Amino acid sequence: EIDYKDIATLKNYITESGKIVPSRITGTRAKYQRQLARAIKRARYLSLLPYTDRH
Amino acid sequence: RKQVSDGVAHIHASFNNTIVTITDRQGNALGWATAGGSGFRGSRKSTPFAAQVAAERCADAVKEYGIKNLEVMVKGPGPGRESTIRALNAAGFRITNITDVTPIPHNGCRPPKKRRV
Amino acid sequence: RRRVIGQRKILPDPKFGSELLAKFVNILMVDGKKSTAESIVYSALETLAQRSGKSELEAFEVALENVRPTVEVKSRRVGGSTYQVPVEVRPVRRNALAMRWIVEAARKRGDKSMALRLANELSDAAENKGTAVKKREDVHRMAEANKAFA
Amino acid sequence: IKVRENEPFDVALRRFKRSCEKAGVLAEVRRREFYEKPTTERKRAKASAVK
RNA sequence: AGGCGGCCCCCUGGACGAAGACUGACGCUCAGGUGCGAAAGCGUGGGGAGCAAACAGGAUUAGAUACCCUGGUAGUCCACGCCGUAAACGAUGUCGACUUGGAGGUUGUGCCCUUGAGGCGUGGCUUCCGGAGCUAACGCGUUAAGUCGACCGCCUGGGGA
RNA sequence: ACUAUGGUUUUUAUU
């Protein structure tokens, strides 16, 4: 729900390009989606998940 | 002077022109061609064929370096981003990778607006 | 926009063995003068008699293999802009175009007489140069300056 | 926004019209598209996909 | 209401529910006045990659002081001060009562092994028909343009203006 | 489908 110390659970809600997948696809709905987005955006700034993608 | 088998191409196609540069993965360019430099003007300077002849002019490069294995990094929206690869991959080279590397603002600072006629 | 038609089928000549003579006498024909057409039909093969090759029965129809049509240009307007496209010649009309290109110099050159104009132009047949070749050569420019059409 | 694919297919596969990329929409729509006006166009038309 | 969508740390406004309870008309509105301003402009210094009102150079053209191409000053960014403007938009003053039916979205609460993002009550927000009524006509229709209770603005043929 | 582009046509008679 908020922590960066596991990415194996966060991988399901992202793409190969590290983009966040919309809640209409993953059954998360907007409320829990907005929590997973915080765990991902923290893991991004700690360089634990890809932020930008070019290739 | 020595055959090294491997290279990487950088292609850009716009609504006015097309650019094709041949490099090594060490960033080093070895030759280049353009659709304008092919002798083309106006609404014709961007065309798939003006770019096809630029690729045939570029496919004469690197013969002494013995390059055959090719990666392609593509840019721009222009129709030239396809005919250039097709012709180069027929001119002795073999493709292994094609990837789009168009640099994009994501997203700022104010939207573009130009030419109203 | 709704009248629909076809083409008239024609038979090979009983003497000349070819379908060329069944149509070519209606080409360069004017004022209904079909006996003048039957009086100039291949009459250049006498001005070319030293350059005719074997069998005068085919010695004019062999020239169509060097008239060699490949493309025809169509020009039409879409919106304000007129465009031009070189399209490949159709499986029967390719022969009709060769039959039209072979008479381009028959009057519109300074040589005097149809037969002499035509024999001089049938001797420029391989390279196609100078006068009376515009409609044969300049149509090909458009198909070598562009090979990406739809 | 940009599309991802390991290689570009040898055909464009166009189901939908006025679509960009792959030799489409050439030097067009050069005016501003706007941030809220796309929603105004979704107010002004609601069955544009089926004309 | 103008408006708010890089992220962080600190600070903070208003809104929503169940049940229990306390206080008790403490509730509403309002000429003048006050606080609030998108953008442009202005006070004043700092900034100023990019975008670009002035404009130059080029090109277009009958002309081109505009539309087109290359630049480029102000301005756009910040702090602080002014200016209150609008196709201000959910166009319709503020507050509150009242009326037949259905379905969807969101989120509390109470209930159901929830042992089901799902149900059955029931609130707040929200979306689309629609009964009664209204409206040249479109349209509103429980977040009414309907029917009532309180208060206050604005209007009076076009042009001149 | 979209050419690169152009400004302007005196007045009046079914009572």
Side-chain angles (χ1 to χ4, degrees):
Chain A
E1 70 179 85
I2 199 57
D3 184 52
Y4 62 82
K5 310 179 194 75
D6 180 18
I7 58 172
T9 303
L10 299 179
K11 170 63 173 167
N12 193 237
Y13 311 95
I14 60 171
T15 63
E16 292 176 70
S17 57
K19 293 194 188 192
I20 303 172
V21 178
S23 60
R24 67 190 166 72
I25 303 299
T26 54
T28 51
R29 299 178 61 262
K31 196 184 179 183
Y32 185 40
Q33 180 78 356
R34 291 161 191 179
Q35 302 185 267
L36 289 169
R38 293 159 190 135
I40 293 164
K41 289 177 183 181
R42 289 175 188 204
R44 277 181 180 181
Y45 281 126
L46 295 174
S47 208
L48 305 173
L49 289 177
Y51 205 131
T52 302
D53 187 76
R54 182 165 168 62
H55 305 138
Chain B
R1 290 181 178 174
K2 304 293 297 190
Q3 300 190 1
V4 298
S5 311
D6 175 63
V8 183
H10 284 272
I11 304 181
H12 190 305
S14 73
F15 303 135
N16 290 342
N17 202 354
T18 296
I19 309 179
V20 179
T21 303
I22 296 175
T23 73
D24 186 72
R25 71 186 62 255
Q26 292 294 339
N28 295 331
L30 304 176
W32 64 265
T34 60
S38 300
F40 295 77
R41 309 298 287 169
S43 73
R44 310 94 73 186
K45 192 177 71 180
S46 61
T47 55
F49 188 73
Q52 192 181 278
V53 307
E56 287 188 34
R57 191 171 66 256
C58 205
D60 183 77
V62 305
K63 297 180 298 188
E64 291 166 83
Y65 296 85
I67 299 176
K68 208 183 181 66
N69 294 357
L70 187 64
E71 300 180 28
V72 193
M73 279 67 239
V74 301
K75 284 185 181 179
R81 71 145 66 202
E82 182 178 65
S83 61
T84 48
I85 306 179
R86 283 170 166 183
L88 184 61
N89 184 65
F93 299 85
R94 54 175 293 265
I95 59 171
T96 60
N97 185 12
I98 306 176
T99 300
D100 182 293
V101 302
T102 299
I104 48 171
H106 56 281
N107 193 346
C109 301
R110 70 194 303 111
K113 62 187 189 177
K114 207 180 181 88
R115 196 156 217 275
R116 72 196 180 77
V117 288
Chain C
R1 297 184 195 83
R2 58 158 59 145
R3 188 175 185 88
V4 175
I5 50 68
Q7 292 183 351
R8 180 168 68 87
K9 307 187 198 293
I10 63 176
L11 298 177
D13 186 275
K15 181 176 173 173
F16 293 86
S18 177
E19 296 172 51
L20 183 61
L21 205 85
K23 187 65 168 178
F24 187 65
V25 299
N26 296 354
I27 307 302
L28 206 74
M29 186 175 71
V30 66
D31 308 338
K33 295 178 65 177
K34 190 172 285 184
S35 292
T36 300
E38 284 198 325
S39 301
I40 71 177
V41 60
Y42 326 139
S43 67
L45 293 182
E46 294 171 50
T47 316
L48 203 71
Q50 76 298 99
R51 289 170 293 163
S52 52
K54 188 180 178 184
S55 192
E56 286 176 55
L57 191 65
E58 71 174 279
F60 199 89
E61 189 166 27
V62 292
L64 280 70
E65 308 201 275
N66 209 350
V67 177
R68 194 179 58 92
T70 52
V71 290
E72 63 183 336
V73 164
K74 299 183 184 180
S75 313
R76 290 272 64 211
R77 175 166 172 163
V78 196
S81 281
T82 298
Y83 298 92
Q84 311 196 272
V85 60
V87 298
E88 294 189 303
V89 292
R90 283 163 279 150
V92 181
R93 210 175 194 268
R94 67 192 182 197
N95 186 244
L97 190 59
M99 202 184 313
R100 196 68 57 134
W101 282 9
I102 200 165
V103 297
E104 280 287 295
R107 202 169 201 163
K108 299 185 287 190
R109 253 194 62 110
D111 303 289
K112 294 184 68 237
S113 80
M114 199 296 292
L116 185 58
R117 290 176 203 121
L118 185 58
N120 192 98
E121 190 64 18
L122 286 172
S123 305
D124 183 61
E127 300 178 309
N128 314 114
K129 287 176 168 174
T131 45
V133 297
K134 184 180 177 184
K135 305 186 192 176
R136 306 172 57 169
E137 287 290 296
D138 202 70
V139 73
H140 190 279
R141 178 162 59 102
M142 201 183 298
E144 293 303 317
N146 194 352
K147 300 189 187 290
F149 284 102
Chain D
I1 299 300
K2 201 184 75 174
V3 74
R4 194 181 191 92
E5 202 80 84
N6 198 279
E7 78 179 277
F9 287 100
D10 197 48
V11 284
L13 305 176
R14 280 182 157 99
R15 190 177 185 93
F16 307 118
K17 293 189 293 180
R18 230 282 178 91
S19 43
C20 294
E21 310 171 293
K22 301 181 189 290
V25 191
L26 308 182
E28 290 196 51
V29 300
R30 294 189 283 199
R31 74 192 300 184
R32 189 183 178 189
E33 209 67 64
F34 293 85
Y35 172 62
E36 298 182 76
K37 205 186 190 297
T39 291
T40 307
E41 299 303 273
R42 290 182 292 255
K43 295 172 185 171
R44 293 172 73 230
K46 297 185 181 183
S48 57
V50 297
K51 289 163 62 73

